[PDB]
C-alpha cells in the first residue's frame, strides 16, 4: 500500500509549488506518485489498482464531481482536499461516507503534511484490516517470543540447514514468522475462542449474516463432520442428499447412523437438478421411515446447495416445509450469496431464524472466495449448546493450527464488507453474464456449429434466473416452479452432439476433446462430462481470463473446421501413444468417440442408473466395521449381482455417488451395473480417454474388480 | 543461495587474474563472493552460513586439507578445483563423497566457467531438495493454470480488493502461487498417493526408517484418529496411557471402545515417569480384562513416548513383552531419534519388524523439527491393509489440502538426511548438554542458592542417560533398570523449594514466578510446574538463545538477592492489580506462595490424586452420547461424589488427564477431589496465579462447577 | 541518540564480513558507526560522548574486561555480544547490572540484527527517560489535538505572521508543539496531580530522597511562599 494520486492542473504557482514540495516529501517516505489527467482518469486508477490509498485534489474545483463517485468504490479511502479562503461544504455531501482531511497551500509546510498523510494511511490500513489479521501482522513486525512451538521459531532452524535455507528464501521472512502456536497470549487461542480469535468469529458472523461463526483449519470435508456429529447421535436417523461430497459419506462411516437419501432430478447431459418439493413433505419422509429398518424420525438433514453445476434451492421453502430440527446446507459453492442482492431467498443464511429449528452452512472459503486452502466456515443460524458444539469442534480441530489459514478465513470475510467488497461480487457476475452474452452472439454470427450456454433464451435481467416448467433449456421434465435458480457465475457450455428432446444427434463433438485442448493452453475445466463443460467465474477471474477463454474457444472452431492433425492440435495426447494418433485428425477423432457414445447408449444408461437407488442392506457404519475385521474380498464387476459393497463407487461422468458402502445391486437396480460395465468397454478403445471409477481397480486383464463383503 | 567462496592469494599473476575475471563474471550472475583467509576460516563459513554453495580453491595447495573436512559437513556441496600440470588424485580421497569439478587457469575463459558453476549450483539445488517440494517450486516459476480452485489463483482475487492487496503484499507472490489443489496433474494427489506425492511418502519413510509413511495436514491430533479408527473397531478393547493427549480422549468419544488405562509412575515434583515393566506383561493385562465389563482382549495399544518431560521408553522391551497385534507410539516429542546414534533401541522405529505385530509412530513435525503448523507424520512398521488404511486416512484428511503444509513435512525429512542433517541433531544435543553443564558449574560457584538440572550427577558420557534404581536424582521409588532413558535436549530445571527425599524445604521459590520473569524478556516456558521448569532444545534453538536464557536466569538471582520491587521486576504482573503489588517485593512474594504450597499440602495431594484412578462407569463414547441427548447438569465441585463426569478434567499443574468422561469420584478415589478443591483455594489469594482447570467453570461467587450427567 | 561503537580486530573472514554487513545495515537506519582500537579506547568514547548507546564486541575476547568497566559508567547501556560455539558466562558477571543481547556471526542475517538493535535502542531510551518527559515527547511525535489552548497550537499562528515565522524558525517545531495546556487528558494535570504528573512527583521524590515532592513553575522565589503560607498563619511567629 504505497500509491498516492494527485489530480488537477493549476496554472497558479502558489498552488503548484506546494504540491511539488509534497511530491518530493512523499517520495522520501516511500510512496509512488501518480498524476491523473481528468476526473474520469482518476476514477479508473482506483478501479484497476487496489494499492491506491490517497487522492489529492483542490477542494474548490472537485468537491461535487469526485466526492459522490469515489465513495461508491471505496468508503474508507483517505481524501486530501486543498482548499482556499472561500470554501463551503455542500448539503449533498452530508449523505456520503467520506474520510476527508483538509490542508492549506503553503511553502515548506509540505514536510509536515507528508507526516500527516503517513499517519492517516496507517490508520486507513487499520480500518479495513480485520481483528485477528491485524494482530498477527503486528506480531510479525514487533513481537519477539523465544523458546516456542513450532521449533523453527520464525525460520531459525531453516537458516542452519543447506536445504532448509532454500525453503526459507522461497516463502519469505513474513510467512515463516507468522507460523506460531498458542504460546503468544495477545493473539489468544482458536480452540478456546478468546481475544482476537473470538473477535474474528464475530466479524465473520457479522459479514456473512449469522448468529455464530466458526473457523475450520482442515477444509469443508472436516466442517461437515463437526456439524454431523453434533446434531446426529448414535442410533439416530439422518436425511442426506444423493448428490453429496465424499466427506459426507465418511461421516456415515464414522458415526453410527441410519441414512435416508434424497432423490435429485437429472437431465440428458448429466447435469444434476434439484430435489423435488414433494421430497420435503412431512408424509413422504414418514413413509420412508416406516420402510427403512431401524429408522426413526430424522434429527439432522443435509442438502447440497448449490449444486456443482450451479443450481440454487429455494431455501425459504425448505426452512418452512421440512419438519426437521436441524437443517444443514453444504454451501461449498455459494459463499458469495449474502453480499449481492440477487441471491435473496436462495441461500441458507437468507431470511433469518426459524422457530425450533437450526440452520447450518459449511462453506469452502478457498474454492470461490480468496483464501488459503483448508479454510472453511461454519455459519449457524439459530440456538445451539455452545459448550457441546465446541466439544465436537475440538474433536476435529488440532491443538496447534496454522495461523495463516485462520487469518485467510478472516481476511476473506473482510474482502466482502463495504462497497469495495460488493463491487467484487457484482463485478464477477457482470463478467460472467457478458461472457454468456458473447457466446450466444457468436453462435448467431459464426459460420456453422458453435458452443451453447446452458441458460434461458432471454437473459435480459441481472438475477438468479428461475427454472420454469414452460421452458426447456434445462432439460428437466415436470420441474417445480419458484424452486430452482441458475447461478450466473456458474457457466456451463454445451458442445454439439445432443438434442433438446434428449435424443442423440448425427454430427457431434465430445466435451472431453475440448477439455484436453484447453489444457494445452493452460485452462483447466472444473467438471468435465460427455457434452457439458463447467467454467467457474470466481472473484479471482478477471477481464483478462474472460477473453483468453473466449479466444481459445474460437481457436478450437478455427482448428476444427480446417481439420488439423491430432499430432499438431493435441501434443499432450499425442505423447501418450505416438503410433496411435500418428495419422488421425481432429475431425476423425471427434466422430469416433461420438459414435461410441451412440453405440454404447451412454446418456440413457446414465439416466437409468441414477433414477433407481440400490437396496440398503446395512448402514455405511456397519459396512466399514465389517471391513475393519478383514471380511472383504475382490470379485469381478460382472459378479457383483446380489453383493454388499464395501467401498463407495464414484464414476466419471457424472462424478456423483452412485453406490454407497453397504448397498446391494439387485434386479431393481440393474441399470446401475449396466452403466459401469459399459464404461469398461468404452474407456478401452482410445488412450487418454480412460475409465475413471473410484473404488474399482484396473487389473492386468482390463476388467475392473470391486471390493465386497465375504460370505 | 548465492554465496561462492574463493580461497587464497597465489602470488602468481597467471592464477590471480583468471580468478579476478571469474569474480566479476559470477557477480554478474547475482552471486555474492566471500574471501576466506585460511583453511579453518573457510570451514567456519560453511558451519555458520547454510547459503554457501561454492568453494573455489587451487587443487595443488589444498588437496589433502579440505577434501576430508568439507565432506563431514556437507557431501553435496559443489567444489571447484583449479589444477596445474602435475596434479594427481590421492588414494585417501577415494573413500570420500565429493562433488569436484576441475578448471584451468585461463584468461577470458572465466565467462564460460561462470555458466558452468551456475549449472552445477542449479544441479546442487536439485540434489538436496526432495521430489514434491522440487515439483511445487517448479510450478510456481513456470506453471500457468487458470480457472482453477482455490479461486484466488496465485493471489489474483486479492489484488482487486483494498484489504486483499495488503494480505498479498505480506505473504509474497511465492506463498500465494504455492497454494493450489489437485487441479495440477504433474503434482498429483495426496488422497490418491500418486506422482510426486507418493515419491514424498517414500522419501520420508526412507529417512525415518519405516516401511510406509503418511503425511497429515491436520496435526498429530488428527494422526491419532487415523491409526485409532483403523486398529480399533466398535466394541473392541483398547489399551491407552493415562499420560495422553487431549486428542486421544476424543478418539474414545467418537469410537465405541472400552478402554484399559496404563499406570505411569510419578515423583514428588510432579514429573510423570514411565509405565512399569509389570504393566506390559501378559498376566497383568489379562486380570484387568476380567475386571472390566464388556472388555475382551486388547487389539490396539497406545503409549506416549516420549513424555512431556522427556523420558524415553525401552521400546525393544515393549515390542517383545506386550502381546498386542497393534502398538501405537505417540512420538509427538521425539522426531529426532532416527538420526543420532544415541537413541538406538529407544524409539518405535528402532530395530525393525516384529512378527505378527504392527508398530505405529505419530510425530509432531512442527513441535521439534522444522515444519509448518498442522504437519504430522504416520510411520508404519509392519504389515497393513493399504486399501483399508487409506479409507481411515481419507475420513480425516480434506480433499483439497494446503500444499505448503505438505511440502514442509517433506522438507523436514530432507533436513535430516546426510551429514548436513546429522550435524543439526548432534549440534542441538551439544548445545543442551553444554547448557546443563553450565548450570551445574554455576551452581557450585554462585554465592548461596542456584537452579539445579533434573539429571544424573555424572553426565560425562554423551547418550540417553539410563534411570538406575541405585540413583535417587529422579525421585521414583523402585524403578525398573534399563527401562527409562533421559532425553538430553529436554532440559528440566528445578527451583529450590523441595528436598531430594520428597519433603518440603524451609526456603523456597515457586517456579510460577520464574516463568513469569522469563516472559518479560520474551522466553516462554513450555511446561510450568510448582518447582519445575521445562525447556526445549530443538534444532531451531541456537547458541545465541542458549546464552540468552543462561543470562536471564543469572539476572533472576541478581534481582532476587538484592530484592527488587514487584513493580520493577514484574511489570506485567503489576498491570493485573496495581494496588495489590504496590508495596510487595520479590522476596516477600516468593515466601508467600511457597508457604501456601506447604499449608495446603500440594505435592502430597498431587501424588495421591493420580496414584488411584476414578472407577469407570461407562465408556467415553457412551458418556458423550448422553451429552448429545441433552441429559447434562452443572453442580458444585464439593457435591460431585457419586457423579458421572461428562467433560475431561485437566488440572494445571501437572497438566495431565486426571478424570475422563464417564468416570466417577468415589471413596477409593477421594484424593482426586481433595486435590481439585485445594486448587480453588490456593488460586484465590494472589492475582496472576489463577487456578487453571480445563472442564471446570469459574463462577460469579468463586466456586468451580463441573458438568455431569442427569440422573 | 545515534552512535553505535564496534570494538575488535578479527583477522577471520567469517566474523569480519557479518560485521561489514551490519555496518551498512545500521548506516541505512540512521546511525553513526565508530571503531575503537583497544579496550581503553572504547571506554573513553562513552566517557566523553553521551550519545553513545551501543557496544558491539566478540564475547569470547572481551567478556571479562569490559563487562565490569562499562557497568560503572552506565548500567542501562545496551551491549551486543557476538559469541561462538564455546562461550560461557562467568560467575563475576552475576553481580553486574548489564543489558546484554547475544547474536550469531552470519551472512545476510545482519539486516534482521539491525532491526533488533533499533528496537533495543528504542527500549533503552524508554528506560532512562522519566514518566512525564516520555509522555510529552510521545505527544509531540504522534498526538493531534486541534482547537486547543494556547491559541498558537504548535506554532500555527506564528506561520501566518511575517514576524511570527522568524520566532517559529528559531525555537524549532519540537519546542512549539510541546507548549500545551491541560486539554490533553493522557498527560494529566499539574494542579490536580494526576497521571504522568503524579508519576513525575513520585519519581523526583524517589531520587532526591523525600516523602512527597512538588514542582514549581515560577522559581524558588515562589516555592518559598507556598511553604511559608502553609506553616505560618496570620498572627503567628516565624524564625
XYZ file of C-alpha atoms in Angstrom, chain B residues 85-447:
363
model
C 50.096 -29.657 -14.998
C 51.320 -32.061 -12.285
C 48.092 -32.776 -10.387
C 47.231 -36.268 -9.110
C 44.375 -37.898 -7.168
C 45.293 -39.318 -3.755
C 44.046 -42.745 -2.592
C 42.665 -41.264 0.660
C 40.201 -39.255 -1.471
C 38.594 -42.471 -2.772
C 36.555 -43.088 0.405
C 35.198 -39.508 0.419
C 31.922 -38.258 -1.078
C 32.874 -35.112 -3.015
C 31.397 -33.236 -5.980
C 34.626 -31.902 -7.515
C 34.706 -30.076 -10.855
C 38.084 -29.214 -12.406
C 39.003 -25.985 -14.222
C 42.055 -24.392 -15.879
C 43.668 -21.029 -15.169
C 42.919 -19.155 -18.400
C 42.228 -15.548 -19.404
C 38.783 -14.760 -20.830
C 37.547 -18.334 -20.325
C 36.175 -17.231 -16.931
C 32.833 -16.258 -18.505
C 32.411 -19.863 -19.692
C 33.316 -21.206 -16.223
C 30.757 -18.867 -14.603
C 27.907 -20.502 -16.543
C 29.257 -23.962 -15.664
C 29.200 -23.030 -11.960
C 25.636 -21.703 -12.404
C 24.565 -25.043 -13.916
C 26.357 -27.033 -11.171
C 24.721 -24.895 -8.457
C 21.277 -25.436 -10.028
C 22.063 -29.167 -10.131
C 23.131 -28.919 -6.469
C 19.770 -27.323 -5.587
C 18.049 -30.301 -7.267
C 20.230 -32.813 -5.374
C 19.200 -31.801 -1.832
C 15.570 -30.778 -2.474
C 13.057 -33.656 -2.130
C 10.708 -34.629 -5.065
C 7.406 -32.898 -4.109
C 8.968 -29.648 -2.831
C 11.087 -29.525 -6.006
C 7.972 -30.101 -8.138
C 5.987 -27.450 -6.237
C 8.729 -24.825 -6.667
C 8.968 -25.630 -10.389
C 5.228 -24.971 -10.776
C 5.500 -21.543 -9.108
C 8.277 -20.456 -11.505
C 6.761 -21.716 -14.781
C 3.300 -23.288 -14.389
C 0.338 -21.253 -15.616
C -3.024 -22.864 -14.840
C -6.078 -20.577 -14.987
C -9.714 -21.262 -13.969
C -8.601 -23.400 -11.017
C -9.598 -23.976 -7.397
C -8.849 -22.293 -4.988
C -10.448 -19.188 -6.532
C -7.547 -16.840 -5.731
C -5.259 -18.466 -8.357
C -1.939 -17.110 -7.051
C -3.432 -14.028 -5.386
C -5.382 -12.644 -8.353
C -8.572 -12.044 -6.337
C -6.542 -10.348 -3.586
C -5.043 -7.717 -5.915
C -8.553 -6.423 -6.702
C -9.588 -5.672 -3.101
C -8.074 -2.871 -0.955
C -7.885 -5.148 2.112
C -6.866 -8.094 -0.099
C -3.785 -6.354 -1.519
C -2.327 -5.937 1.987
C -2.723 -9.686 2.558
C -0.929 -10.375 -0.745
C 1.981 -7.963 -0.158
C 2.639 -9.530 3.257
C 2.996 -13.233 2.384
C 4.512 -12.562 -1.050
C 3.805 -13.950 -4.555
C 5.656 -17.224 -3.858
C 3.465 -18.097 -0.853
C 0.278 -17.305 -2.790
C 1.205 -19.158 -6.002
C 2.109 -22.272 -3.973
C -1.484 -22.602 -2.724
C -3.301 -24.884 -5.192
C -5.391 -28.086 -5.409
C -5.314 -31.436 -7.257
C -6.115 -29.488 -10.459
C -2.407 -29.596 -11.330
C -1.809 -33.020 -12.889
C 2.016 -33.055 -12.719
C 1.963 -32.678 -8.912
C -0.561 -35.488 -8.363
C -2.915 -36.050 -5.428
C -2.418 -36.579 -1.680
C -5.514 -38.766 -1.143
C -4.651 -40.952 -4.148
C -0.902 -41.164 -3.343
C 0.149 -40.600 -6.969
C 3.139 -38.974 -8.692
C 5.361 -36.653 -6.586
C 3.006 -37.231 -3.618
C 3.955 -40.933 -3.484
C 7.637 -40.056 -4.013
C 7.416 -37.776 -0.962
C 5.942 -40.527 1.241
C 8.649 -42.970 0.122
C 11.316 -40.338 0.853
C 10.068 -39.723 4.413
C 9.830 -43.479 5.080
C 13.424 -43.950 3.877
C 14.832 -41.168 6.094
C 12.770 -42.037 9.200
C 13.378 -45.802 8.757
C 9.826 -47.030 8.127
C 8.045 -49.435 5.770
C 5.234 -46.977 4.995
C 4.780 -43.288 5.843
C 1.842 -40.868 5.576
C 1.522 -37.068 5.617
C -1.198 -35.488 7.770
C -2.403 -31.947 7.026
C -4.230 -31.555 10.358
C -1.565 -32.220 13.011
C -0.896 -35.153 15.343
C -4.323 -34.558 16.916
C -5.770 -35.985 13.686
C -2.984 -38.530 13.065
C -4.001 -40.432 16.214
C -7.602 -40.842 14.985
C -6.419 -42.323 11.670
C -4.447 -45.070 13.444
C -7.079 -45.308 16.208
C -10.093 -45.970 13.969
C -8.128 -48.412 11.786
C -6.737 -50.647 14.547
C -9.812 -50.453 16.805
C -13.332 -51.363 15.577
C -16.545 -50.801 17.571
C -16.989 -52.998 20.656
C -13.282 -53.837 20.873
C -10.939 -53.248 23.826
C -8.090 -50.705 23.750
C -5.019 -50.003 25.877
C -4.327 -46.294 26.409
C -1.765 -44.400 28.514
C -3.153 -42.130 31.248
C -0.466 -39.602 30.294
C -2.166 -38.985 26.938
C -3.025 -36.074 24.640
C -6.471 -34.409 24.502
C -6.956 -35.893 21.003
C -6.643 -39.489 22.241
C -9.537 -38.719 24.601
C -11.605 -37.511 21.624
C -10.762 -40.790 19.846
C -12.577 -42.704 22.604
C -15.508 -40.254 22.429
C -16.192 -40.882 18.715
C -15.288 -44.593 18.549
C -17.297 -47.089 20.621
C -14.397 -48.704 22.511
C -13.836 -49.880 26.094
C -10.507 -48.576 27.465
C -7.984 -50.006 29.933
C -5.613 -47.337 31.258
C -1.873 -47.742 31.880
C -0.463 -46.627 35.250
C 2.600 -44.344 34.890
C 4.953 -43.573 37.812
C 5.379 -40.107 39.366
C 7.792 -38.272 41.681
C 7.408 -35.558 44.347
C 7.813 -32.635 41.914
C 5.046 -33.729 39.521
C 7.222 -35.118 36.723
C 5.457 -38.105 35.157
C 7.715 -41.151 34.880
C 7.369 -44.242 32.707
C 4.863 -47.081 32.963
C 6.430 -50.020 34.910
C 7.532 -53.255 33.183
C 4.914 -55.247 35.129
C 2.060 -53.374 33.395
C 3.040 -54.619 29.912
C 3.148 -58.323 30.845
C 0.553 -60.871 29.671
C -0.793 -61.636 33.174
C -1.495 -58.091 34.436
C -3.458 -57.127 31.297
C -5.482 -60.370 31.458
C -6.652 -59.606 35.010
C -7.967 -56.133 34.100
C -9.830 -57.581 31.091
C -11.630 -59.867 33.567
C -12.238 -56.971 35.993
C -13.659 -54.562 33.385
C -17.174 -55.260 31.993
C -17.680 -55.516 28.200
C -13.902 -55.874 27.795
C -12.198 -58.546 25.687
C -8.512 -58.961 24.766
C -6.956 -55.620 23.628
C -6.426 -55.167 19.868
C -4.720 -51.737 19.936
C -2.284 -50.272 22.488
C -1.339 -46.580 22.769
C 1.737 -45.401 24.712
C 3.046 -41.816 24.867
C 6.764 -41.988 24.036
C 8.465 -39.891 24.971
C 6.835 -37.979 27.855
C 6.303 -34.206 28.014
C 9.217 -34.024 30.482
C 11.433 -36.089 28.151
C 11.615 -39.718 29.259
C 12.198 -42.413 26.632
C 10.739 -45.914 26.973
C 12.742 -49.060 26.229
C 10.871 -49.982 23.035
C 12.861 -53.190 22.448
C 11.266 -54.435 25.683
C 7.687 -53.357 24.839
C 7.745 -54.824 21.300
C 8.618 -58.274 22.698
C 6.775 -58.267 26.057
C 3.412 -56.762 25.020
C 1.287 -59.394 23.255
C -0.927 -56.957 21.318
C -1.148 -57.111 17.500
C -1.144 -53.296 17.173
C 1.217 -50.995 19.110
C 0.918 -47.194 18.826
C 3.629 -44.744 19.904
C 2.649 -41.073 20.240
C 6.036 -39.686 19.163
C 4.990 -36.017 19.151
C 8.078 -35.239 21.248
C 10.782 -37.401 19.603
C 11.068 -36.819 15.825
C 14.904 -36.735 16.058
C 15.636 -40.266 17.327
C 16.420 -41.934 13.980
C 19.363 -39.634 13.122
C 21.594 -39.560 16.216
C 23.366 -42.829 17.214
C 22.414 -42.372 20.904
C 18.655 -43.068 20.508
C 19.140 -46.722 19.460
C 16.536 -49.067 20.959
C 14.595 -46.162 22.473
C 12.138 -45.231 19.693
C 9.325 -47.163 17.967
C 11.109 -47.220 14.592
C 14.280 -48.764 16.080
C 15.303 -52.370 15.362
C 12.678 -53.262 12.763
C 9.725 -55.593 12.199
C 8.063 -57.733 14.879
C 6.367 -60.993 13.803
C 2.565 -60.677 13.680
C 2.709 -57.171 15.177
C 2.462 -53.696 13.636
C 4.224 -50.652 15.139
C 2.973 -47.070 14.687
C 4.545 -43.636 15.184
C 2.648 -40.330 15.080
C 5.102 -37.422 15.090
C 4.652 -33.677 15.564
C 6.867 -32.465 12.717
C 6.455 -28.800 13.708
C 6.906 -29.073 17.504
C 10.615 -30.023 17.384
C 11.590 -30.350 13.714
C 11.367 -27.579 11.103
C 7.898 -27.564 9.501
C 4.671 -25.531 9.268
C 1.918 -25.986 11.870
C -0.588 -28.857 11.452
C 2.153 -31.020 9.895
C 2.249 -34.641 11.076
C 3.739 -37.999 10.077
C 2.420 -41.540 10.485
C 5.242 -44.095 10.357
C 4.195 -47.729 9.945
C 6.485 -50.645 10.807
C 4.849 -53.955 9.843
C 2.084 -55.315 7.614
C -1.064 -53.257 6.983
C -4.046 -53.295 4.626
C -3.177 -50.374 2.329
C -6.681 -50.283 0.809
C -8.389 -50.144 4.224
C -5.858 -47.820 5.904
C -6.389 -45.211 3.173
C -10.130 -45.283 3.944
C -9.438 -44.219 7.551
C -6.880 -41.739 6.183
C -9.379 -40.141 3.767
C -12.011 -39.774 6.513
C -9.936 -37.233 8.449
C -7.888 -35.668 5.624
C -9.522 -32.994 3.440
C -9.969 -33.358 -0.341
C -8.111 -30.093 -1.020
C -5.043 -29.819 1.272
C -2.672 -26.866 1.793
C 0.404 -27.657 -0.333
C 2.629 -25.541 1.942
C 1.985 -27.830 4.917
C 2.552 -30.905 2.725
C 5.871 -29.512 1.422
C 7.200 -28.566 4.880
C 6.590 -32.138 6.078
C 8.756 -33.421 3.207
C 11.406 -30.688 3.595
C 11.766 -31.589 7.289
C 12.783 -35.114 6.245
C 15.328 -33.703 3.770
C 16.787 -31.587 6.590
C 17.723 -34.849 8.352
C 19.379 -36.873 5.558
C 23.182 -36.892 5.209
C 25.868 -35.299 7.391
C 24.296 -31.879 6.761
C 21.226 -33.273 8.523
C 23.122 -35.285 11.150
C 25.007 -32.188 12.370
C 21.727 -30.428 13.233
C 20.634 -33.065 15.771
C 24.171 -33.702 17.086
C 24.528 -29.914 17.384
C 21.276 -29.431 19.314
C 22.314 -32.191 21.736
C 25.728 -30.494 22.044
C 24.049 -27.189 22.989
C 21.726 -28.723 25.603
C 24.473 -30.743 27.345
C 26.670 -27.621 27.384
C 23.755 -25.709 28.950
C 23.264 -28.476 31.544
C 26.974 -28.416 32.451
C 26.918 -24.606 32.737
C 24.077 -24.698 35.295
C 25.915 -27.265 37.467
C 29.184 -25.314 37.124
C 27.488 -22.052 38.163
C 25.677 -23.893 40.983
C 28.995 -24.738 42.679
C 30.472 -21.273 42.021
C 27.493 -18.998 42.820
C 27.018 -17.497 46.282
